[PDB]
Amino acid sequence: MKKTKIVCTIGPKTESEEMLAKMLDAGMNVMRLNFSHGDYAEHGQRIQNLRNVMSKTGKTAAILLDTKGPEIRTMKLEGGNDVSLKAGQTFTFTTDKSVIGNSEMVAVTYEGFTTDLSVGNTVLVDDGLIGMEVTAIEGNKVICKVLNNGDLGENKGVNLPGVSIALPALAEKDKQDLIFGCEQGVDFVAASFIRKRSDVIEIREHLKAHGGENIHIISKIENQEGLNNFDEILEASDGIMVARGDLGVEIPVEEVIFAQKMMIEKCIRALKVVITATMMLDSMIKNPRPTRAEAGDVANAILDGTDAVMLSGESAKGKYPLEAVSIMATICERTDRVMNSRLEITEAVCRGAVETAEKLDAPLIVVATQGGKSARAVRKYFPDATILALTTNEKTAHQLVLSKGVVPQLVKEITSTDDFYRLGKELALQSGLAHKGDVVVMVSGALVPSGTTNTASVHVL
Amino acid sequence: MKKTKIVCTIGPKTESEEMLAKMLDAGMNVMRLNFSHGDYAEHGQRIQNLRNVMSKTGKTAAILLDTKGPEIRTMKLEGGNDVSLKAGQTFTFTTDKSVIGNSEMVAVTYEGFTTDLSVGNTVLVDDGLIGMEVTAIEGNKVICKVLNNGDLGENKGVNLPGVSIALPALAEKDKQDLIFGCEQGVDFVAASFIRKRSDVIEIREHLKAHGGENIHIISKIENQEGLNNFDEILEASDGIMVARGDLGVEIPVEEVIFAQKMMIEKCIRALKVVITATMMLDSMIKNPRPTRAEAGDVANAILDGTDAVMLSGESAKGKYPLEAVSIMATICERTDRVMNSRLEITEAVCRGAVETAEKLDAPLIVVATQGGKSARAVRKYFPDATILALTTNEKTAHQLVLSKGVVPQLVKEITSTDDFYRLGKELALQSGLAHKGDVVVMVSGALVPSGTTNTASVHVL
Amino acid sequence: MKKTKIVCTIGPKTESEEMLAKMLDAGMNVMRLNFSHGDYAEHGQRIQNLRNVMSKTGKTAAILLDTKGPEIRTMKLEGGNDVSLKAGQTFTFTTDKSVIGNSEMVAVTYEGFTTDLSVGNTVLVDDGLIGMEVTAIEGNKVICKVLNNGDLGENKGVNLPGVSIALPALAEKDKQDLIFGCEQGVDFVAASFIRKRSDVIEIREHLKAHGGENIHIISKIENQEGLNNFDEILEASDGIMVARGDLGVEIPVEEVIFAQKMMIEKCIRALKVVITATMMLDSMIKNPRPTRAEAGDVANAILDGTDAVMLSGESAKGKYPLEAVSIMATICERTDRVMNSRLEITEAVCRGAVETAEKLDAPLIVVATQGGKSARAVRKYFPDATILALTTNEKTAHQLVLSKGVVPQLVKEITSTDDFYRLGKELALQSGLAHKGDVVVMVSGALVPSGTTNTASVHVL
Amino acid sequence: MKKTKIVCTIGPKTESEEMLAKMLDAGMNVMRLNFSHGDYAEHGQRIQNLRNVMSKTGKTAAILLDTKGPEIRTMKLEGGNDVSLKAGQTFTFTTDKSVIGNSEMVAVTYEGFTTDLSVGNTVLVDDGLIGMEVTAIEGNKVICKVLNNGDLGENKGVNLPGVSIALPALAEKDKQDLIFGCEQGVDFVAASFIRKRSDVIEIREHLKAHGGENIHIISKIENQEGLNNFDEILEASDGIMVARGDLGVEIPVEEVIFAQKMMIEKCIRALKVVITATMMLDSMIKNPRPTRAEAGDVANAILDGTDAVMLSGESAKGKYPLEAVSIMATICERTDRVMNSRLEITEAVCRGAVETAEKLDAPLIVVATQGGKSARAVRKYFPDATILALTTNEKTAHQLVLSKGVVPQLVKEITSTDDFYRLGKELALQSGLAHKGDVVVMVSGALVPSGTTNTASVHVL
């Protein structure tokens, strides 16, 4: 069975229950809702469908709300026509959202473009298709020198590598998309363009402002500042999504795999889920097979140690959504199966539980948990055993779906430590994960508040 | 505080309570009754007094009954006079108990002296004072050549180094001594001259026949057969007693330390106490200080890893019983304090507990136990932590006194695993062995019959 | 300084000396000649220029001759027009090179298509684009079931995975390329489409037949067969080139990274250079910057542990040959720099030399070597020190260019072990790789025929 | 073959060549000359005989001159008659060399007895036979209370446990003894009663004053001050002699084994031989068999790690000198055979050499050495391999007998590193310590002054 979990963005080709059900089947574990597009009724029905499928089949899934977040865009061109920039030329950016640009100038949606930039700074346009150098700044104008030939279209993304931008943490719309999220009760929010811990807290404050206080916040690392503030961001969030594509636009190429690796490792050490994201099977938006280069990159994320892998357009609008979920899974299964535990108070207990589980060959580790901490603490060592996580918190069951190799199970009550061992035993067996005569290792907390894992116990089924 | 336990033989100079009380204070932990001498009323008062002091002070101790054992002795001499044997001479042993010997021959109490011996065999007499070689066996006669000059007194101990003797496991007085042992409820019986598992089983059966089935049997290895059968002996015993002295007459001197070593190591591995015994502070039978040679010997037995050290004549009849108890304990304390854990299902759990105890610096390990198994399973690793051992079994409480660094405590009930943690926490504190904020590691068995230790939990006081 | 070495394929845009010089400068260590194209006089001049640059600058490089190898093509179609085949359809292959095919069958260049195939076998066409089932073979005809929809273009590769083809190993045109190679004295021959150890030997026998017995043979694993016979291939060759692209055609995607990994690992253990090859910075054939996916793929090859990385079209015919050498190198330097030694008779000595070098902090390991084995043997552990390799064999010095982090140096004589230490100290200093006061670890063979490394010696500069 | 070396004191019953030859044969490796007795002619003939046996048999031995050292002694008594002291009594010591003592007072040979002592201090007399408490010091008088009954004989040794004494490093007769030592070319001097480094230097200076600069100095630690200054003593000495018995009168008994342990461990770490000495087989002064306690104590000293063991009286005047040598060696052979290497620039080189010897199973390590350092450095790790040590220095060959498991061999020249491997191979073979096909590890120094071991080489015979 794979352990690495797969997050799929759901779109209109993939939203029916029927599809939903086909996807959980091929390996889907979380549904992602990309608020870059769609309205609240579409999303709602999507949430509802999933939830339907869920109730109908007994499968579990989780629901991740992706915010759209702050951005700087170029706007419109003459006659809606493309313009050819030429290396060396001068090109100029205007804050005047009224201007209609041409081959010499264009407007930008971001009234602060002037202040945040600085002569010498680089401007990149259309996910890096064109780069320019800033020569001068005056009035509403940024004047640059195009450093390379390319066609500027209408409404294009601008990157300001190394630059810190004064956009706020939450775009405007952004705020209403989280309220919605709270109202529907999503299990995670993936917040875009995080650059500093201050940005996390703002998102937590909104959530908490709307009853979304138990919603896990996944900060998306997408540029250099964020990369820089990684540690403090990480400390404030419940987890991370490394966006290779965005990073590869903001920072030196040779540094992007190293950033992924690093972030991945700090997550696992912090007990915070991490998602590996942009540019996974993108060729499948158009083909029914990924390329070899693509297969190795995902493999290598799994090997880097991620908890989950994510499909974007491959599953939202491509022509083979189910073919991607399916190859995405054989690759997880196959990568996962050649990985090893990493042994190298919660910690002591949990490493011991894992080390023991392995020494006794137990196929299963059973953990009791309120917040999900102890299922994460065991997953920190990359057990060979599957983790059967019992909990009475619904949210916690949902959120554990995202964790590597955990199988959450919602229970009505856990009266006591021996009560857990009994129940854990029943379930072990009920789960077809183990059979009479297997050793099982059961971890939980005893006379300690949630957040402390201090007890390990070996049992024979 | 020392960990190594002290076994003291009680004699008529040490039997008063007052004494008993000054000895428990100096470090005695178990009182040995040597049934080589004394009658049942003496011994009984002895037990009674000890049990007195115990109830009067709240101290705990254990009682070990030492059997006297089968033996081969030489018998009487003309006029009760000693005869000087001379190297080179012919000398002869006769199984004819009626014979009254002289410088040419003497009788032996052991009818099988001529069948078990063989031409070429060595006979030793009077604790190795004189040796001889067997040249011929015929009729009731064993004819030797005296290898060395010496004087043969009457009624002396004979050693048949390397020979297997068909004396029985037990002697006619040995059997009454154990029934007495049973009526009095001693905690352990140290059986003498054990040579083969069969001997153990006989002992076990005799005890079981008289309600003594819960008495721990300690086999005394005193000769080469025993040594050879170590492994099946150990398997059948609840423990061992290494009698260096005897060993030293029966086997090559250079092997004796090695025997002691080996045997201590296999006891600890098997979870069976072991006692290091003859020749420990014997000089103190006459002096109030042991000799430096002597001190190293004990120290070294502690370092070889023994649970206990045993005082003989030094405390039963010597002039300085309480000086010997006291120098024995400073040595214990001083050696014990420079030792280290040896980490290298029950086992996995216990090693981890100890291993975790040390990583979190816990001064105490608290164990629940019926039989004593789990307290011994944790001592296997020579913890730095004291072991606080809770049990509802009184016998168990007593026998655990003999175990290295265990403090046993009798409780009225342990209703459940959470119950134990609460209970063990109160006592940990109550015992002044830890204080508020110390980490304590609690071990027990959860949903498993006695004899399985499968649970470890860390708690802060 | 980077360690991982860079093989660059030289073409007509890159062959000047001027260029050659600018590339050595950017990181090129080996020139690859792609015999898929060009003639003997172009090649010869290429070799000669490289050799000029070398002699003029003192730089060292090595020269790798790639053979072209055996193939199986589909041929021409009606009007040069594509024809779309549809699943379930019957389609068929003819050996008759005169047929002009259409939607129902085409011609293949390999007369033995019929005998080597077998009803039930799979035929793959066009780098796997379309697959078919062997239904029938009769006459000059192999008849199959198209298993998937696609369009057959003209002149398309065919793969017969699992099947052994009777094509010889060395194409009788190819044979000519090796002779040339021997006359010019290339350092390595990379042999195409190796499937089995018998294929290696065939190459070796040709080389030996023409004075090229000292030329290292790199087998290119490019298919399932080869993959399967990897071990016996490895044993017969002097090294390997893992051709991910070809592999990805013949075998299941999700296995392709795993094959690379494996193969890299058994190389290093065997002391046989390994190159990682197709699909490295291909985008740069057209852009001056690779993609972030490409940059992690290389990195990851370096992390998998390859000795070298190779540029194909990026440096032979693309628009930015020197931009690819150069990003290729920053990526090497960058990856190389965060890697660690792998410690985990030649073996014992060399492991030790490395472990010692690291404990003493030596910036450099000096090795004496005839065949190169002792430089590879130290390189097996990924030392942090640079390897300075002395040798009197010219071929040895050239081929060591291809080894990870080795700096070869040709010397006139090494009279004795003490002579080596003296010489090796001079050169260490002469090299600016160490300075007065650094520890240096010197490894060599003493009173042993080449092929044994038995001597290690530490010295201060 | 035993590794532990045996130091035998040579007296008049053992000085004949015949005897010397029989002992070399039982295991004697060094001859000790105890200058507490004999005159120069006796000793010289003793040296001569041993040297004879040597030359006659090709055996090697070393010679060790034991200084008598300074002392405090009680002097004469009225009529030469013993006086019984009674506990509680007052008894007084006088500095006045003229007094003739009785039961109330006696004189001491040590003028500083009054200054160095203090009220409260303990004075022991006649090897601890009697102890007394100092109550008052006045004039030439030290007044005490006898703590125990006993009889005072004349001319008896006194201990001031815990006291520092201003006796000089050396006695007047000690000085003449060393001059003789130097004339005879003894190999080691064991200096008695070393308390502080200053003492070692004194000894060194006198030796140096008389051509004895190459004689190794072995400090004897006999008292608490000694013990306290251990480290600086060690540093100055070429080695140590642990005098357990002396220690045992000067310091708490329970510290004495720990003293031995510690000092044996710091000698091995410092590459300085150590000798375990008083109280080894003393009972054999009178019997032909040691006691079991005795045998454990030695074995245990070999296990603590000493390089040598020493016979005293047992081999100088006892009745069974050759039985004591002989049991001393069985015990050595038997304890030594169950030990293991301890692996845990000279160092690095040497640990690896041993580590490699074991991994390749080499039965011998051959070392080149001027001063003996590298032989000691390999021995530091308790190799299972014998050390064959080639040197050109005869003193060095001699002193190396004293080291654990080294076989020293005097050679005429070692021209070069390869020369060494050649030679070492011949001799390895010539020594019947190895055979064709055995791996041998050869260690030395290459292009480094003596005192640096930087080269290790593996060879097959």
The answer to whether the Cα torsion of A76, A79, A84, A89 is positive or negative is negative
Catalytic, out of C73, C175, C266, C425: C73
Of C360, C447, C454, nearest to D418 by CB-CB distance is: C447
- Find the closest chain C residue to A331 by CA distance: C254
Output the CA–CA distances (angstroms, integers) from residue B218 to A416, B195, B275, C265, D215, in the order listed: 41, 13, 9, 57, 56
Q: Are C151 and C190 in contact (CB under 8 A)?
A: no
Beta-strand relationship, A439-444 and A455-460? antiparallel
Dihedral pair phi/psi, residue D178, rounded to 5°:
-75, -25
Q: After which residues is chain A broken (C to N over 2.5 A)?
A: 344
Q: Are A64 and A218 in contact (CB under 8 A)?
A: yes
D454 to chain C: which residues are within 8 Å by CB?
A: 457-459
- Token pair belonging to B143: 């004819």
Catalytic, out of D46, D195, D220, D404: D220
> Which residue from A215, A222, A165, A216 is spatially nearest to A193, judged by alpha carbons?
A222
Q: Do chains C and B touch (3 or more CB pairs under 8 A)?
A: no
- Find the closest chain D residue to C360 by CA distance: D345
- Token pair belonging to A292: 């070899």
Q: Which residues of B342-370 are buried (b: 16+ CB within 10 A; e: fewer)?
A: eeebbebbbbbbbbbbbeeebbbbbbbbe
Q: Are C27 and C57 in contact (CB under 8 A)?
A: no
The answer to whether the Cα torsion of C299, C301, C304, C309 is positive or negative is negative
Output the CA–CA distances (angstroms, integers) from residue A74 to A64, A134, A153, A157, in the order listed: 29, 16, 9, 7
In angstroms, the CA D17 to CA D54 distance is 9
- Residues 6+ positions from D44 with CB-CB distance below 8 Å: D180, D184
CB contact under 8 A, B422 and A356: no
Cβ neighbours of B90 (radius 10 Å): 13
- Find the closest chain B residue to A356 by CA distance: B348
Q: Are C254 and A295 in contact (CB under 8 A)?
A: yes
Q: Which residues of D412-429 are buried (b: 16+ CB within 10 A; e: fewer)?
A: eebeebbebbbbbbebbe
Instruction: Tell me which residue has tokens 């690379």.
Output: C260
CB contact under 8 A, C253 and A295: yes
CB contact under 8 A, D417 and C417: yes
In angstroms, the CA B114 to CA B111 distance is 7
- Token pair belonging to B115: 């069948």
In angstroms, the CA A245 to CA A279 distance is 6
CB contact under 8 A, C456 and D459: no
Q: Are B256 and D292 in contact (CB under 8 A)?
A: yes
Contacts of B among chains (3+ CB pairs under 8 A): A, D
C255 to chain A: which residues are within 8 Å by CB?
A: 334
Beta-strand relationship, A406-410 and A386-391? parallel
Q: Do chains D and C touch (3 or more CB pairs under 8 A)?
A: yes
Q: How many helices (H) and strands (E) does chain D have?
A: 16, 21
In angstroms, the CA D35 to CA C374 distance is 58
Distance (Å) from the C-alpha of residue C266 to the closest C-alpha of chain A? Answer: 17
- Token pair belonging to B412: 């009225």
Q: Are B6 and B329 in contact (CB under 8 A)?
A: yes
Tell me the three state secondary structure of residue A448: coil
In angstroms, the CA A431 to CA A434 distance is 7
In angstroms, the CA C20 to CA C325 distance is 11
- Residues 6+ positions from A194 with CB-CB distance below 8 Å: A169, A200, A219, A220, A221, A222, A226, A233, A237
In angstroms, the CA A276 to CA D432 distance is 66
Tell me the three state secondary structure of residue C226: helix
C349 to chain D: which residues are within 8 Å by CB?
A: 356, 456, 458
Q: After which residues is chain D broken (C to N over 2.5 A)?
A: 344
User: What value, to the nearest 5°, has the Cα angle with vertex C261 and ends C256 and C267?
Assistant: 125
Q: After which residues is chain C broken (C to N over 2.5 A)?
A: 344
Strands (E) across D249-399 are located at: 273-276, 308-311, 364-368, 386-391
- Residues 6+ positions from A75 with CB-CB distance below 8 Å: A97, A99, A101, A106, A107, A108, A109, A154, A155
Dihedral pair phi/psi, residue A391, rounded to 5°:
-155, 160
Residues of C at the A interface, defined by Cβ within 8 angstroms: 244-245, 247-248, 253-258, 260, 279, 289-297, 299-300, 327, 330-331, 334-335, 338
Q: How many residues does chain B have?
A: 461
**Beta partners for C137?**
C142
Burial of residue B310 (number of CB atoms within 10 Å: 0-12, 13-18, 19+): buried
- Token pair belonging to B114: 């001529």
Give the dihedral of Cα atoms A275, A276, A279, A285; nearest 10 deg: -50
Report H helices in D251-320. Answer: 256-270, 292-304, 313-316
The method recorded for this entry reads: X-ray
Spatial strand order in the sheet of B141-146 = B105-107, B90-94, B141-146, B130-138, B122-125, B158-159
Of D360, D447, D458, nearest to C418 by CB-CB distance is: D447
DSSP-assigned letters across all residues of A54-72: HHHHT---EEEEEP-----
Residues of A at the B interface, defined by Cβ within 8 angstroms: 345, 348-349, 352, 355-356, 359-360, 416-418, 421-422, 425, 439, 446-448, 454-459
Q: After which residues is chain B broken (C to N over 2.5 A)?
A: 344
Cβ neighbours of D342 (radius 10 Å): 13
B441 to chain A: which residues are within 8 Å by CB?
A: none
Dihedral pair phi/psi, residue C324, rounded to 5°:
-65, -40
- Find the closest chain D residue to B148 by CA distance: D288
Of C258, C293, C327, nearest to A279 by CB-CB distance is: C293
> Which residue from D354, D364, D298 is spatially nearest to D325, judged by alpha carbons?
D298
Dihedral pair phi/psi, residue A263, rounded to 5°:
-60, -45
Domains and CATH numbers, chain A: 2-69+169-335 (3.20.20.60), 70-168 (2.40.33.10), 336-460 (3.40.1380.20)
- Token pair belonging to D119: 């009220």
Q: At what angle do helices C253-270 and C292-304 cross, to 10 degrees?
A: 40
Distance (Å) from the C-alpha of residue A370 to the closest C-alpha of chain B? Answer: 18
**Is C404 an active-site residue?**
no
> Which residue from D205, D241, D204 is spatially nearest to D226, judged by alpha carbons?
D241
**Is C220 an active-site residue?**
yes
- Interface mutation target, options D246, D247, D254, chain B, most CBs of B under 10 Å: D254
In angstroms, the CA A316 to CA A314 distance is 6
Q: Are A375 and A403 in contact (CB under 8 A)?
A: yes
The reported resolution of this PDB entry, expressed in Å, is: 2.8
Instruction: Tell me which residue has tokens 């010692």.
Output: C356
Catalytic, out of B2, B3, B5, B220: B220
In angstroms, the CA B436 to CA B429 distance is 7
CB contact under 8 A, D458 and C352: no
In angstroms, the CA B2 to CA C166 distance is 82
Strands (E) across B153-303 are located at: 158-159, 188-191, 216-221, 239-242, 273-276
Q: Do chains C and A touch (3 or more CB pairs under 8 A)?
A: yes
CB contact under 8 A, C345 and D457: no
- Residues 6+ positions from D200 with CB-CB distance below 8 Å: D169, D191, D194, D217, D219, D233, D236, D237
Q: At what angle do helices B17-26 and B321-336 cross, to 10 degrees?
A: 20
In angstroms, the CA D262 to CA C188 distance is 61
In angstroms, the CA B226 to CA B205 distance is 20
In angstroms, the CA D459 to CA C446 distance is 9
Q: At what angle do helices D40-57 and D172-184 cross, to 10 degrees?
A: 30
Which amino acid is residue D13, in one-letter code? K
- Token pair belonging to A218: 């996944």
- Interface mutation target, options A159, A250, A253, chain C, most CBs of C under 10 Å: A253
DSSP-assigned letters across all residues of C245-284: HHHHHHS-HHHHHHHHHHHHHHHHHHT-EEEE-SSSSGGG
Q: How many residues does chain D have?
A: 461
D355 to chain C: which residues are within 8 Å by CB?
A: 352
**Beta partners for D191?**
D219
- Token pair belonging to C46: 């290429």
The answer to whether the Cα torsion of B424, B429, B434, B439 is positive or negative is positive
In angstroms, the CA A106 to CA A95 distance is 9
> Which residue from B433, B331, B455 is spatially nearest to B387, judged by alpha carbons?
B433
